Design a protein around this ligand. Sequence first.
Ligand SMILES: Cc1cc2nc3c(=O)[nH]c(=O)nc-3n(C[C@H](O)[C@H](O)[C@H](O)COP(=O)(O)OP(=O)(O)OC[C@H]3O[C@@H](n4cnc5c(N)ncnc54)[C@H](O)[C@@H]3O)c2cc1C
Ligand SMILES: CCCCCCCCCCCCO[C@@H]1O[C@H](CO)[C@@H](O[C@H]2O[C@H](CO)[C@@H](O)[C@H](O)[C@H]2O)[C@H](O)[C@H]1O
Ligand SMILES: CCCCCCCCCCCCO[C@@H]1O[C@H](CO)[C@@H](O[C@H]2O[C@H](CO)[C@@H](O)[C@H](O)[C@H]2O)[C@H](O)[C@H]1O
Ligand SMILES: CCCCCCCCCCCCO[C@@H]1O[C@H](CO)[C@@H](O[C@H]2O[C@H](CO)[C@@H](O)[C@H](O)[C@H]2O)[C@H](O)[C@H]1O
Ligand SMILES: Cc1cc2nc3c(=O)[nH]c(=O)nc-3n(C[C@H](O)[C@H](O)[C@H](O)CO)c2cc1C
Ligand code: FES
Ligand code: FES
Ligand code: NA
Lengths: 248, 380, 407, 197, 204, 403
Amino acid sequence: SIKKTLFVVIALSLVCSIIVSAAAVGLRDKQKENAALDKQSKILQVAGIEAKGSKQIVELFNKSIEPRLVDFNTGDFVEGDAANYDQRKAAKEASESIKLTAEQDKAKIQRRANVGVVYLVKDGDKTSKVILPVHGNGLWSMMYAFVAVETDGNTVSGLTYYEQGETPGLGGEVENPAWRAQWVGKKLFDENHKPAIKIVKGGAPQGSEHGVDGLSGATLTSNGVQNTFDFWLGDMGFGPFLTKVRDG
Amino acid sequence: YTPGLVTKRSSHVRDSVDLKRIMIMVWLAVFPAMFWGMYNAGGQAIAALNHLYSGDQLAAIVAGNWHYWLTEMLGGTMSSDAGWGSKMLLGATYFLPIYATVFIVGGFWEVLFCMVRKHEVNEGFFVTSILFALIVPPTLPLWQAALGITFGVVVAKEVFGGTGRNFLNPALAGRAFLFFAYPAQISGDLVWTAADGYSGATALSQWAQGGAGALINNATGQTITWMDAFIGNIPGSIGEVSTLALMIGAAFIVYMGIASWRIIGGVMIGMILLSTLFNVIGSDTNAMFNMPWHWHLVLGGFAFGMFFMATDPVSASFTNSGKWAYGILIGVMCVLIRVVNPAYPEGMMLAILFANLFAPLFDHVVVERNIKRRLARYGK
Amino acid sequence: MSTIIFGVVMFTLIILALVLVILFAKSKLVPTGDITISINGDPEKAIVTQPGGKLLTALAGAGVFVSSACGGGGSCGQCRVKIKSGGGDILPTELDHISKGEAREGERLACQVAVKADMDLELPEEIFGVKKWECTVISNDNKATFIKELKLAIPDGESVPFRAGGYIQIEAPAHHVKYADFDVPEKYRGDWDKFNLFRYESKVDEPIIRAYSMANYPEEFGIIMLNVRIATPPPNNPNVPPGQMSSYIWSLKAGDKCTISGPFGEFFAKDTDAEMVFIGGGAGMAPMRSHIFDQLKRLKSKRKMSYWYGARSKREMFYVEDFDGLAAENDNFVWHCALSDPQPEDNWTGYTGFIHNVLYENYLKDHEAPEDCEYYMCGPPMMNAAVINMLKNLGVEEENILLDDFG
Amino acid sequence: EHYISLLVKSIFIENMALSFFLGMCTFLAVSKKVKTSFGLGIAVIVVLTISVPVNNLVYNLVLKPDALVEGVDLSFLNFITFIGVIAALVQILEMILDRFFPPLYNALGIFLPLITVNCAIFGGVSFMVQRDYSFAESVVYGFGSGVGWMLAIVALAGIREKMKYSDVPPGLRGLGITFITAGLMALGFMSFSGVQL
Amino acid sequence: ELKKSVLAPVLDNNPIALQVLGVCSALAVTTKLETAFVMTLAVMFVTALSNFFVSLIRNHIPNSVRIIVQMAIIASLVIVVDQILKAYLYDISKQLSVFVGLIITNCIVMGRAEAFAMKSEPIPSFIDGIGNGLGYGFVLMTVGFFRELLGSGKLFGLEVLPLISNGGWYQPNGLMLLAPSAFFLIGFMIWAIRTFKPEQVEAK
Amino acid sequence: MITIKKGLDLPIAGTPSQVISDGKAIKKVALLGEEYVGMRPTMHVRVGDEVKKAQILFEDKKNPGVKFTSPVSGKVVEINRGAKRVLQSVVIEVAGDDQVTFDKFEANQLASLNRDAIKTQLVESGLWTAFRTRPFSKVPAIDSTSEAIFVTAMDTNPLAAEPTVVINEQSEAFVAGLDVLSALTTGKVYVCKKGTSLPRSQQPNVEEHVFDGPHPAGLAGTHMHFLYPVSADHVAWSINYQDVIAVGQLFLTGELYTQRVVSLAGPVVNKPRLVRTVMGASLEQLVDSEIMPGEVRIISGSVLSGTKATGPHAYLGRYHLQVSVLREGSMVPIGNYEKVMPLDMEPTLLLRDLCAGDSDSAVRLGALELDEEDLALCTFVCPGKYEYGQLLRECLDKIEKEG
Ligand SMILES: Cc1cc2nc3c(=O)[nH]c(=O)nc-3n(C[C@H](O)[C@H](O)[C@H](O)COP(=O)(O)OP(=O)(O)OC[C@H]3O[C@@H](n4cnc5c(N)ncnc54)[C@H](O)[C@@H]3O)c2cc1C
Ligand SMILES: CCCCCCCCCCCCO[C@@H]1O[C@H](CO)[C@@H](O[C@H]2O[C@H](CO)[C@@H](O)[C@H](O)[C@H]2O)[C@H](O)[C@H]1O
Ligand SMILES: CCCCCCCCCCCCO[C@@H]1O[C@H](CO)[C@@H](O[C@H]2O[C@H](CO)[C@@H](O)[C@H](O)[C@H]2O)[C@H](O)[C@H]1O
Ligand SMILES: CCCCCCCCCCCCO[C@@H]1O[C@H](CO)[C@@H](O[C@H]2O[C@H](CO)[C@@H](O)[C@H](O)[C@H]2O)[C@H](O)[C@H]1O
Ligand SMILES: Cc1cc2nc3c(=O)[nH]c(=O)nc-3n(C[C@H](O)[C@H](O)[C@H](O)CO)c2cc1C
Ligand code: FES
Ligand code: FES
Ligand code: NA
């Protein structure tokens, strides 16, 4: 009967939506805090700084990580609240972001912020390494990673994907310690200052300077990682900054 | 004690042809490609070795590889002044172990299935064994050849009931297994020449990087001309290099009626059309766009597949109209993979395999259309 | 709870829009009301039934009854019906019991067919003309060790209309019956006391319906003779429940009542001059008796008639006096019987063994035209399967042999 | 234009069955007969071509962050909203088969309802939200994905019909060999692996 | 009561071997035993709870809108388990990853919801979810064992076969990492299951 | 007119001279039961019975009313039966000159005769068995009718006799037979011949159609496919030219005409030529004193399609007009089958259906248009050495039975 069907669907819809809406909105706040603490944990992990517990991570992160702002169009340090900078929100607004062309959008990211935060790791009063956030569209979700670049501006010290929504086992292997550890020692550029990090389907030759094995059965997610690095290491990303990092 | 007419009305005469005779014809058809392959395999290896080493350094290399000093023991010479006998002898030391391993390992699976399931052994395995051994890199490890034939014989043929009862090309299915399971041994610059410590890209890889002008034999320093690729004096799979040798064998089986000329014609039509289309469109960045049809013919395994594997009767379409479509799809797919797929320098194995999947559908479209004419009594 | 409220209402709106489309689609795509099914094209026989349920259920409620043995399982195939229209194509299970040529006609299994839209039916006279009567038991005496003769009497005074070789469906409710309740003569009791079949007790959980062939030629009026074989667990599976319907019949005696639910059957002879051959076995003596009686006085046929009954012992033999009279009175009919295992006291001096080979070694072996003979068979599957194989080895076409195996 | 390329991606390069391995449960089940396989493929196109663009509008108009009101993002109502929408079309579809249901309703049985809950259908909506496709691109993508799915299912049905002459061991007959056949089909569809966009 | 219902869907009515459900997830997570094991637990928990709830409302489900009711129960539970996990046990929440979508479309969750929940009482319906998920995991983990061992030399991330990359004699097999290997492995599991249980063999 | 290109003419040594001579005297004759499709005999004779020329020997249980009459007058010397008592042959020893006569009519009346009258005379005389239905190549039911009757006035079988030479001797009987077929057919009569000239019927119903080309061109199935495609609901009748002469003789003289002209040919035939014999003639006696020494095989019919004339089957078949003598010496399609099939069919797929037993699919692909002989060339060229004539009858029997 029409009367029974509308009653059950409405009643079932209301109870389930209320539970879902309450759970999502209510636990969102706790989730928001937990996720933020994670990024400080990731920057430390890639930096090689062992931290454990929210206070150790927050305390060690503030002291040891020197967030700074960089203008991509010039690759030079700028002044702002780097510690409280949300590059993601900026990339969504035309005021502090640009729209990429089909040709330019190698990483498949719709927009790129005019200014992006970088993190400097300081063993003492100097920079022992610089950590650059790079993101690019995956098969299922955007994949955000941290790349620890040594003071040389060429050698990569560490890699970690702090945001991914690819399928675990296939595309979620950006989190696999073995795959991330494979990046240590690789070179981001060639002699001609052109991106040379390449994700090799089927496995890079052992000892390759710029060869990281792709994610098995996950070409689309591996393509995103390549697309991530092909853009952010390029002209419109951190390319100019790394040349400057390279000279100083 | 008196059978009925059923058993007695059998056609009292039969054609001399039988399945056993068909297979030997295909088996003999590849002998010219096989023999040249061994000769080419030894020649390529000897040239690279002299280009990489000399003096006592060459002697140490020859002494540390059973392929080299076994050739010396039997009367050959690893020096560059070696004649055809030593080159063919050295190439045999690579082909024969691969062919022996493939024959023995694959034959074991053939007999095992027939024995357990009470089937009589079938002679189709003669073609599968020889073709698989002639489409692998010369340096392929034997243990990988054993696995490749095992996958091809078992997964592609036996589990479907054996010869005449499968849908996918067994030999190419085995090669795909090695291609995707152990790509390092069947893809790259270290497997297509048997000179240890030698790195050399084959012609197709070279054209995709730079252009036809980049077509160089690193060992000799001499340019690779179209004539070179046609005769097969180029690096590659033992058996694919010589377009001339394959044509000679292909002519016989085509003449004997064992290999379909509609499939072969379709492959050429698809290849010429698409490659010419790429030529006209052009690409300032992708060098594969400018490869003409006549270069596509003498490069890679296009010739071997068109002549000896696309013509696999069981895996192809069973209708004359479908055979054209089946061949055209192979030729189109091969050029497409060759040109617009960066990962693969050649795409014939994948191309034939793709076409195998769709040959039954092409027949269905054709056969259902015949039924529409029949249900209309052919308009009579 | 600002966002929680907004999501809850927006969710409901999305759901309401989706269901409203579905509900709207249901109204404009799914039939409403009641389903009307036409039976034989006669408006009176047309049945108006609400949607849902199988066809075998709706038809039974109306005045037309469809024969069914397996029921709602689609196994026997005796409930085949002609669907002129509706119902779609034949389900794959139905094809197991219906040939493609039959499918062209429109034959379908009512039970396997689900009634969901208007359908057309052409049920025949026999299926339409089913009458339920409750006869009175006169005699339930045991003819043999495991065979009982039942004399059911119609209370309406009018005899039963049926063809030779027909059958009547017997329906009984749930009931617990013990084998000890059966009354058996001393002759057959002695065989029964060795294995003590009286120990078995049957408990029919749900009402059951079965079929029983007739043992009275039509001219016999007022009485439904039936021959019943007691159902006991299988020789290979003693760990089986005992008989439920046959056991219930055996429990009855003089004065008892049972339902016949009208007649049915498709076992009959051919109105020709070809020689007739009868092969009876066990409970098969019921339909065979009707054929011989039908062909002697109902038809007064002068055609050659032969009967070959398979029995295990002289005790097992019954109806011998009637067969002897028919053979003696009319020479056109001759009956014979062979004992598969004569008792020591029987001292049988006639045919011994199975009619499978006895009939061949005596009559069909020297027969000039075994194919030119109508064959009718009813008995244990072993006897039927073996006999038909022997008949087939003699070049007897299936159209010349009619099988009515009772299991 | 750009659209033809999108259609090519969603049919061949991104073949949902043989490339992405989505919808294998219905794909490996109704694969025996070309006519039945073709009917399901047609229905899948119908469901896909309607499901994706409708969910695209709902996502961009309701579930899109900061879309209905500024500061409220109903992203968490993404999976429940989409599956519910997909389920509705399936619910309408079941009745619609009743007009063409004899050929497929009996054969599909349990899987007609299971079209909702097909990895292929849910995934297509996800890509339409994980990516940013206009309404015109959503229709082209949805139709293309369905057609590519139909090509694979219809192809597997052609192969299986051809296997009437095959001699399959018992135990592999039916599902077991079908899985092997599908694995072999995926092998040949890997020809497009390097193809990009 | 007995364990027969729990173990029936393991080898007698395996959801992937005899029935055809959940194959899509089998080909993605059977690359690792770790991912496979988590997927089995997720499917077991969700199938059992969802089957349980549908039984409570079985008599009230309209066939017209049954699918909506069935999916809503499944989707709500999966979303909540994801939200609950994100707020508490956030580290594991990342682990559930995209498995929120991959369990909703798992055909086992809806398949058992219609065949069993709709025609059974909730308590036995719950037992159906635990049992079906078990058989799903029997196939998932058996395939995961071969794919991880032969494709990576590792089981649960622990190196059983030394890899050449680590100076180990074993060269990993690249096909075991891709989808086709799972197709072939599952087919051979069906062969073993149906040759040891001929009752399940398909007729001719 | 209609030209055939796809086919095969087997170039076997020992072609006949195409001159009609007298064969060895025949004192033994038989009718072969197994030749008639779906024929279950009801015997009307016993061993030792004396029979007349056109006396009934047996009847068909599954084709009621069809009478199989003797070819000669004499004695029944044996009734050979095989497995399950299948009637192989009913041998009659020639003796005497007795015959059963029938009504005779003028030539100008035959075209006007009532259809039922023609059927009765043909059925009673036993000449009704000359007709075969195409969709099953069975003797037509007595009560059935056909809108298209095909006359095979050509013979492209290897070593076959020339119909023109035989028809030339019996021009009046052949024309009279065509007139009778004109009245018998509901539609038209198709006289399928080669380019050569033949006597013509004055009826507008009788149309002459020329077929040229290799072997398959001379088969009634080929002619039906091009002129009157057959299906379950479009049934054609087939009759060869010598039976047409017999039909004309029956309705002109009132007597069953049983003489036949058959080519005795083959590599081991010393003087291959055309010989006069009788229906069902004993082939052992027919080839006596005409074969080279050695172990030879006598074949009723052509080498492509025919019965091994050994033992109970060593008699001329009903539909066979030639005797060929020879010395005793998995569906992998390489394109051989298509080359010998001129019909609008996909032969490899059809043969696969027969191998697989897919009866319904084979029906869809045109099995119903086929007789076993239409698949003889496909059998000949088969690398797997399948015998498709047998597979087709198994499929056709299945269709008849289930249908
Ligand atoms: C046209 C026709 C005519 C027939 N005529 C006769 C006739 O004249 N006489 C006659 O006796 N029968 C006749 N039958 C057979 C009749 O239908 C019954 O099979 C018979 O009466 C026994 O009934 P039952 O239910 O007790 O047998 P069943 O119980 O169905 O027989 C099964 C066998 O196993 C035992 N068993 C009981 N319950 C079970 C169970 N649940 N599972 C397994 N085994 C079980 C029984 O003891 C028996 O041995 C006829 C059938 C047909 C179709
Ligand atoms: C019926 C049997 C026939 C046997 C074989 C048939 C082959 C027939 C030739 C097919 C057409 C050849 O096609 C023509 O080939 C020549 C090379 O020869 C190409 O010549 C060149 O031109 C283009 C210019 O755009 C260059 O980029 C490139 O080097 C090459 O393509 C032409 O671009 C192409 O148009
Ligand atoms: C990658 C490129 C190669 C693959 C693409 C090219 C092949 C395309 C195949 C489409 C699928 C096959 O399509 C097939 O077409 C035929 C007519 O030809 C349809 O025709 C048949 O089915 C219809 C269904 O309504 C019925 O009327 C009848 O049984 C018949 O006409 C088949 O039902 C269908 O199965
Ligand atoms: C159904 C799907 C397909 C089924 C087939 C898949 C089977 C997968 C498991 C294959 C394992 C083979 O494992 C392989 O054994 C061989 C045997 O020497 C080892 O081989 C090793 O020693 C040999 C000895 O000559 C050297 O030549 C070789 O270079 C070296 O690798 C490999 O290092 C090892 O990796
Ligand atoms: C003309 C011809 C070509 C063949 N080509 C192949 C082939 O390429 N690969 C193969 O494994 N077998 C080949 N065979 C052998 C056999 O036909 C084939 O394996 C079938 O797929 C199944 O036996 C060929 C046979 C013939 C007659
Ligand atoms: S009741 Fe037995 S099949 Fe219908
Ligand atoms: S379609 Fe069944 S799990 Fe994906
Ligand atoms: Na390429």
